[PDB]
Design a protein around this ligand. Structure first.
Ligand SMILES: Nc1ncnc2c1ncn2[C@@H]1O[C@H](CSCCNCc2cccc(Br)c2)[C@@H](O)[C@H]1O
Ligand SMILES: Nc1ncnc2c1ncn2[C@@H]1O[C@H](CSCCNCc2cccc(Br)c2)[C@@H](O)[C@H]1O
Ligand SMILES: Nc1ncnc2c1ncn2[C@@H]1O[C@H](CSCCNCc2cccc(Br)c2)[C@@H](O)[C@H]1O
Ligand SMILES: Nc1ncnc2c1ncn2[C@@H]1O[C@H](CSCCNCc2cccc(Br)c2)[C@@H](O)[C@H]1O
Lengths: 336, 336, 336, 337
């Protein structure tokens, strides 16, 4: 099941329209260019590896900041288009497009710095951070990585409207006489399938019932295998009383340069990006009072479809009110 | 039990506050006075039986119309108060209060006309109509009854907000860990109990999806036993497409006098009364298209709680989509 | 009495009532805290749950480690309780016994009795008597949860609440209501309104003196002690003004081996569905700050599972007195 | 690429949400129920094969019409759910759910009638009509197919905004300094990529410039291989003057029973369905006068991705002006907005 979804993934990224959609996100493109250009000393006369370069934009940023040689690896057919852009911008002596997967190609040389845009939904979808970490085999002993660190933020939320939307969709299968047919036997199954879907969109920050818990991956130290099973303990101190309908996820990445640390944030308090935010709904919400603690674990298991199985166990400590939920990030509901 | 329900019923009607609340309904009181006074020749020098007179207001209307003798039968303690008002209004020679049930008291004389206010929610609640029909044992052959007829109007409606309200209430019992306790096994029962509740309130007529079907009871012709089982067939021609969440009920009564026929209407196209309107919800709504026929039966079976067990079977004939519902008219949801 | 008892148990047969009581977080949360934080009183013990309803308290006792819990319920709700015991897989530890605690058979004396027997003013519905009756199954070292109950009384000033009674009763003070002179009933209407205890909450500023506390020790009290409750009071007025009546609230204490947990319905505490109760004087009494208001509140158990309330109060320094009779079975729910 | 394509396809159809989305389409479900119930004589005490039954709704309709035995074949995981419903509606004696592809499973008995919903975009997308026709090896000689026939309708359209959209979108690349990068060299490629996408949406019928040309497939007569290469000649009698930007496509299917013929239509003159309509743009527009003829061919080549490559050649006969396009139906642009 891994090979087929990998084929579909790279076919999806072979399209210029996807490159345009991602490049038109000005937060992404502008933050990356700021991180690279304001840290020009991390690129001046340096060797760069651009992992999953796509159309090559990050490599062009590296060249703008003064890089001597940039190896831009790309496994999709977009590599060819990148080469076209390298020629038409007269950067053939500085940007070397290397077609293929970063786990299989040969570089002639170790690099001073690795740059990439490997973030997916919840920072981890598409599992490309594993390729980003794998590329560290080419990194000189004290080399740098752009982005350097990644923070996933989790926070309980209340949203009755979203819960009722999904619950009603599931309740379609509560009908006992749909065109004279009893569907009710499948209702449970339907509910399960509907609540396994993470909800990808934005929201007002006032739905957040507690301060976010932060889980940090240091890309300078993380190993690829570390991303196969990600265990995130959490303990929220509730600031508002009400129903917890689930957990909201967003992420920031930090480019820790020798001049400046530049943050790319997809937080709901920041301008919207094409990453949006992700929300895992409980099949049944948990009541809590302000001052209570909501504690548990979010376990992300990498699956062979370049996504994650999400398991959220969360309990209100004061009453012992527990919730266990399973989700699949490969079937997200693009609500917006 | 029947005895205990009757005890509670008459204790409820012993309170002056209930008399005030019913009498402050200007549609009820004003329409009754209009029907009696504009048909004064049906009362001039006549013999009147007031069934369940309460404080006696209808007996006073009959006296204003010139009734020679009015027997005002009341089983609650309110009978005493009626006598006070008879004495303080100097009508001791024309209004005779008779305490007790009309089924058990003895009147000295056959009456020219019976007047009563026997209508409950859906016109049938409290089963007082039976007592009303029973009073015909005292009616002269040329006698009349005010009200003379009663029309029950049914009409399919769409109200997603009401359905969502009741469903959300029932969803409390879907919790797997309410204070660590699994309630979900009762959810079905919960849903049933919530959708057995008739919803007593008013609504905009724009929620009605077909012209009303009318079921008429002729109080002059009807016998008491007829009200033990009431079958109301219906075949609506759907005027709008969408979800039928249930059936709405209201009623009219006609005082068919000699001079004039006067109508008392509780329809949603009419000024609101304390009867409001009554809606019966379906646990699963029925999708219908304009031009379809929604056919079925409403069955009222008299129970020992001075009320009716209601069965409503409806189906969209084009698709065979069917809905069977039970409603306990002894547990209404007053939505205001 | 039977006609009221059957209606009482029919009322308590509905899942909506159980849900409304369970959703009161003060009630359910305080019971769970008291049982769990006194787990040494429950670990491996025999427990009797008097009037278990849906069984929630029995589940709390099982969570604390009870070896066997007998949960007795007289309404049809007992059936649902059984469903919850099977679905939570506690049949070997929780035995649901349908019927009244005075009539069912327990196979074993219990280590501790738990119950939620509190009504309005702590005594309404008379279930405390059943609670005390259950002591026939208590071992000589047995404990009661709740262990004690304090009823608090305090004089209040509310000119507008007093005004409302006459504004409502003055409906009857009309010489031509549709041509009928209603005035002769005005006095009765007034009396009827003043005989209603007023169930709602209020600002603690309306209290004119520190409360007087009357305590029932459930470990020592006998059933017949609750048939006639005499509460003398001598308030030392902290403010000058008119006293329109007495305000009532209550607390109960669970006195466990580890700690004592209080459940309070005081107006200084968060609102519960018990609210607070206010009994007006027919005529207010003027008191200066520093005067003493002395008198007696006599609660007499009646045949409708409630109490007749006789209140006699006087300002000692002036001799002004007021005497008032109320029926707690017909309270006026004023909260909106 | 059949392996990845088909595993993705069946995983897509394993979801109850997709089944519900198809069932809630009242045109689809209602028309199928009408065609089966109003032709009860074709099902009463009959043997029925349901091809790709999904949750089994069509098998339940056939049961409503009195079918003696119904084999419901489903290749996705939805078969499990189908089985559940068969048990929960007390029809295990009459409906047998067979999990697996209709080309690979073994039906013990020859059937009197085959029912299915194999239609995709342009009636041919997802290539399930091939499985529907392959199922005829289980059909009795006098048997029937529900649906019986299928008409694909082509019609020239004018949509200036739609045509200009492609160049507006591709012109993102026609920038000499996008964050300091000259993207211009890719603009042309972008254009090509946009023009290879059939546009799935609806439109007002007034953009249609001529009566549709209809290509009929008769499922009772057609062979599976007939759908590997579909050549649709067209000559349109232009009813309006203007610039033709491409061809619009929709389809109907007809259930031809003993009692009645029932039509399920996805035409733009009919209420919208989840099939919408499909529009393929020419590379360059062609001016045509009303009374001119627009002639050419739409050649559908079945490809390995359970879809079709669409080759379209058109010319205004009275002027000789011509245009063409080659589109990939596996990657349509969902424009419904
Ligand atoms: N092993 C590999 N070797 C070489 N290249 C590889 C490898 N894996 C992947 N790639 C290439 O990197 C690129 C994907 S990462 C972009 C991640 N942002 C997604 C995104 C989601 C939501 C909003 C926004 Br806004 C952006 C593609 O070009 C892909 O083909
Ligand atoms: N067998 C009997 N013999 C003698 N009297 C009897 C007997 N049964 C009953 N009554 C008396 O008739 C009266 C009840 S009918 C009023 C029905 N409208 C209700 C109502 C509902 C919603 C809105 C509005 Br506005 C009014 C009471 O006084 C009652 O004590
Ligand atoms: N002799 C008996 N034997 C067995 N069970 C019995 C017996 N008497 C009663 N019960 C059961 O106990 C339960 C009633 S107590 C709830 C008292 N809170 C009321 C209340 C009022 C205001 C606010 C809030 Br908040 C709660 C019912 O389930 C009832 O059926
Ligand atoms: N060889 C096979 N053997 C057995 N079953 C098979 C086989 N191939 C597929 N199937 C099953 O047939 C079903 C097809 S979906 C109905 C096709 N309309 C789509 C559609 C598109 C736009 C709008 C709307 Br409205 C509906 C799926 O369940 C699929 O799993």
């Amino acid at each position: 099941t891994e090979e087929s979804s990998a084929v579909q993934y790279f076919q999806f990224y072979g399209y210029l329209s996807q490159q345009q959609n991602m490049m038109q996100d000005y937060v992404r493109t502008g933050t990356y260019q700021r991180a690279i250009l304001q840290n020009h000393t991390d690129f001046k006369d340096k060797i760069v590896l651009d992992v999953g370069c796509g159309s090559g934009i990050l490599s062009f940023f590296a060249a703008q900041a003064g890089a001597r040689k940039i190896y831009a690896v790309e496994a999709s057919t977009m590599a060819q288009h990148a080469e076209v852009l390298v020629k038409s911008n007269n950067l053939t002596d500085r940007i070397v497009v290397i077609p293929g997967k970063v786990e299989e190609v040969s570089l002639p040389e170790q690099v001073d710095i690795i740059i990439s845009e490997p973030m997916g939904y919840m920072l981890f979808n598409e599992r490309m951070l594993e390729s980003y970490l794998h590329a560290k085999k080419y990194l000189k002993p004290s080399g740098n990585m752009f982005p350097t660190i990644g923070d996933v933020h989790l926070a309980p939320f209340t949203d009755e409207q979203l819960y009722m939307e999904q619950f009603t969709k599931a309740n379609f299968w509560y009908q006992p006489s749909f065109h004279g047919v009893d569907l009710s036997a499948l209702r449970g199954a339907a509910v399960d399938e509907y609540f396994r879907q993470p909800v990808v969109d934005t929201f007002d920050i006032r739905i957040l019932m507690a301060k976010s818990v932060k889980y940090t991956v240091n890309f300078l130290e993380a190993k690829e295998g570390d991303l196969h099973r990600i265990e995130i303990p959490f303990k929220f101190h509730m600031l508002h009383s009400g129903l917890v309908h689930g957990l909201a996820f967003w992420f920031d990445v930090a480019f820790i340069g020798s001049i400046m640390t530049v943050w790319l944030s997809t937080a709901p308090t920041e301008p919207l990006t094409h990453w949006y935010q992700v929300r895992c709904l409980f099949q049944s919400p948990l009541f809590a009072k302000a001052g209570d603690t909501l504690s548990g674990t979010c376990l992300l298991i990498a699956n062979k479809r370049q996504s994650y199985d999400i398991s959220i166990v969360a309990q209100v400590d004061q009453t012992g009110s527990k919730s266990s939920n399973l989700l699949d990030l490969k079937n997200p509901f693009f609500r917006y």
